[PDB]
Design a protein around this ligand. Structure first.
Ligand SMILES: NC(=[NH2+])NCCC[C@H](N)C(=O)O
Ligand SMILES: [Fe+3]
Ligand SMILES: [Fe+3]
Lengths: 341, 338
C-alpha cells in the first residue's frame, strides 16, 4: 500500500497502459474529497457540481495528478488505470438489476469520485439516447439482455468499437470505475500498430471512403441522426499525424462507400488486425480506467451473470477535451447531454 | 452582464501567484521550457483557490469576451527598460512574468505557439518597434491594430489569447467586439455560416517578422495560405451562441459572391462600432475568448526611450491533441513544425 506508477507495454505500444497504484493515504484523501462533494452537491452530474468539478479535481493527491497529466498529453495512450480506491462493499449493497435502479444513494460517492478523476482529463458529457442522458452511467448485467448488443450483455461478446464512432462529438476518453468484479471480467482493448499493416491499406484508411452509421442505441440534432443512417457522410477511419494517427471504427456499423471495393478490403484488413490485437484490462473494486477513445476500440468478453445482486458493476463516463466544440448539440452552455438540443 | 469577468487579486493572492511564478523561475530556464510546460497544468493548480474558481467560471462561459485578472505584482525597477524589439525581449528580469502568464493560461487549456511567429516562441512579446509604427503587426503604434480573431486563417487558431501587461504608462486600450446575431439579421448570419470567405495569414507570419535564419520550410504553408486561401465560414456552431472567425485586414468574400461581400462589409461595420476598450495596466492579465471576440489595440505614440508599453502574450488551445498533424511530436507546442 505504497504509491507506485509505471508503463505497461502491449505489442509495440510502449505506453499502452499507464498504471497508478494509490497509497492508502492517497485512497483515503480521494475518498474524503468524494464524500465531501456528495455532502455539498446534489448529484455527480448536477450543474452545481459540474461548474466546480475541474477545480475540485485539483484537490486529488498531487502525485496522482502529475501521473494523470502525463497520461492526458500521451497521444499514444491506450488506457490510464488508477488502482486502489476505497470501496465499502457492505455499505454499497447489491448490484442493481437495471441501470434504471442503479443511481443509488449508497453509490453516489463513487459517481462523484469518477467525475473528479475524469475532470483532470477534460469535461464530462453524456448522450440523450443513452441511460436517459445521465453523465454518470451504470454498467451491469440485465436479466433477459444476456445476448443483447449493449453494455448490459453477459453471455455474448460486446463487439469492439470506438465509442459513438459515427459522431463528430464522440468522447476523447471513456472512464470506468469498478465497484465490484468478483469474476475478474475484462474490458477488451485494441489500437492500430501501423508497422503491422500494409502502408497501402493505411493510405486507404486515411481516405474519406467509409460510412460509420450509428448503433440503434442512437429536431435539428435527431434530423442529423436519421440522415447519418440513410445518407451517411463519407468519413476516414484514420486521421491526424502519420506518427500518431487517431482511430475511428465500429466492427458492426462500418462499411466502405458504395462500389469502393478497395476501401472494403482495407476495412476488412483493419477489422482482422484489431481483432487479432485485442487485449484485456480487468478492473477490481476501486480500479478506474480511462480509455483514450481517439486511439483504441473497446468491448467486453462473454461472462456468466448470476443476477443475485453480486454481479460486476461499473460507473461509466465520457470525457471531451473540448466541450465548446459540441455547443450546437447541447441544450445550453453548461448542459452536458449531447443531442438534448 | 459577465462578458467581461474581472478578478481583482487581494495582496495575499497577488503575493501567492508571484511566489509560485518565482518558484518556477528558480526551477526552469524559460517559460516555454519543455520540462516546465509538461509540469504547467499541475503547477497552475497551486494558484489561489478563489482565483482558480473564477477562471473556471470564465472557461465554461460560452458568451465570455474576456477574463481580466487585475493586480499581479510587477517590480518596475527590477524589470528594467522595455526592449526595442521582441527578439531582445526574453530578458532575465521578465522571465517571472512569462512563467506566471503560462500558469494562468494552463487553467484554460494548453499553451501553443507558431513556427512562423516570433521565431516559434510560445510566450511572445507585444511592444512598439521603431520602423513598425504604421505596420499591421502587434509591434505597431501610430496605426491602430485592426480588430481580428487571432490567427483567423488557421484551423489551429487559439481558443484564448492571454495578454499580461508589464507596462502601459499611457493607458493604451485593447479593443474588443463580439457579434450579436439578432443585431445584424438572421439573413446575414446564414451567409456568414457559409464557406464563402478567404482568410489570409496576417503579416506577423511572414519571414520579414522572424529572424533571417529561420527555416524557409516553416513559411511554405503560410505563403500557400496567402496565395491559395481555402473557402471558409466566418460563423460556426450553435445559432444561439455562434463562434466568430474574421480578420478586418486579411478577410475577403470569394470572387463573384456579392451576397457574401455584402455580409462581410455589414459585419465589418457592426464590429467596428461595437469595438469597446479594455485597458490592461501593469500586472493585469486578460484572456480573450478567441471563439467569441475580435480584438485590436488603439493607436498610440511610442517614445522609444525604454518606458514603452510591453505585454507578454500566449495562445491557449482547449484541445492540444487536435493539432498533432501540425506539431513535431506529442509534447511539442509549436504549430507548423509539421
Ligand atoms: N488585422 C490585423 N492587423 N491582423 C493581425 C493582428 C496582429 C497579429 N496577431 C500579430 O501578432 O502581429
Ligand atoms: Fe460501449
Ligand atoms: Fe491579436
Amino acid at each position: 500500500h505504497h504509491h507506485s506508477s509505471g508503463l505497461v507495454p502491449r505489442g509495440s505500444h510502449m505506453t499502452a497502459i499507464r498504471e497508478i497504484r494509490l497509497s492508502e493515504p492517497e485512497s483515503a484523501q480521494a475518498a474524503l474529497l468524494a464524500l465531501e462533494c456528495a455532502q455539498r452537491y446534489a448529484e455527480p452530474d448536477s450543474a452545481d457540481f459540474l461548474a466546480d468539478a475541474a477545480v475540485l479535481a485539483h484537490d486529488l493527491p498531487r502525485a496522482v495528478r502529475r501521473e494523470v497529466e502525463r497520461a492526458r498529453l500521451d497521444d499514444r495512450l491506450h488506457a490510464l488505470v488508477v488502482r486502489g480506491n476505497d470501496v465499502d462493499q457492505d455499505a454499497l449493497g447489491p448490484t442493481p438489476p437495471h441501470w434504471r435502479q442503479a443511481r443509488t444513494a449508497a453509490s453516489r460517492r463513487y459517481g462523484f469520485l469518477l467525475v473528479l478523476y475524469a475532470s483532470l482529463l477534460g469535461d464530462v458529457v453524456g448522450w440523450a439516447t443513452q441511460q436517459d442522458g445521465r453523465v454518470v452511467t451504470d454498467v451491469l448485467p440485465i436479466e433477459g439482455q444476456e445476448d443483447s448488443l449493449v453494455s448490459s450483455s453477459s453471455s455474448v461478446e460486446l463487439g469492439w468499437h470506438t465509442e459513438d464512432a459515427f459522431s463528430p462529438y464522440r468522447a476523447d476518453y471513456v472512464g470506468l470505475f469498478s465497484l465490484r468484479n468478483p469474476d475478474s471480467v475484462a474490458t477488451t482493448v485494441a489500437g492500430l500498430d501501423p508497422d503491422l499493416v500494409g502502408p497501402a491499406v493505411v493510405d486507404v484508411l486515411f481516405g474519406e471512403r467509409f460510412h460509420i452509421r450509428p448503433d440503434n442505441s442512437h429536431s435539428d440534432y435527431f434530423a442529423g441522426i436519421v440522415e447519418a443512417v440513410e445518407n451517411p457522410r463519407a468519413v476516414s477511419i484514420l486521421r491526424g499525424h502519420r506518427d500518431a494517427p487517431q482511430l475511428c471504427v465500429d466492427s458492426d456499423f462500418t462499411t466502405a462507400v458504395d462500389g469502393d471495393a478497395e476501401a472494403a478490403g482495407a476495412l476488412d484488413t483493419l477489422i482482422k488486425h484489431l481483432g487479432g490485437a485485442l487485449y484485456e484490462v480487468v478492473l477490481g473494486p476501486g480500479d478506474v480506467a480511462f480509455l483514450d477513445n481517439r486511439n483504441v476500440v473497446h468491448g467486453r468478453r462473454p461472462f456468466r451473470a448470476r443476477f443475485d445482486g453480486t454481479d460486476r458493476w461499473l460507473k461509466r463516463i465520457n470525457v471531451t477535451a473540448d466541450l465548446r466544440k459540441s455547443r450546437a448539440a447541447r441544450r445550453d452552455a453548461q448542459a452536458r447531454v449531447l443531442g438534448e438540443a
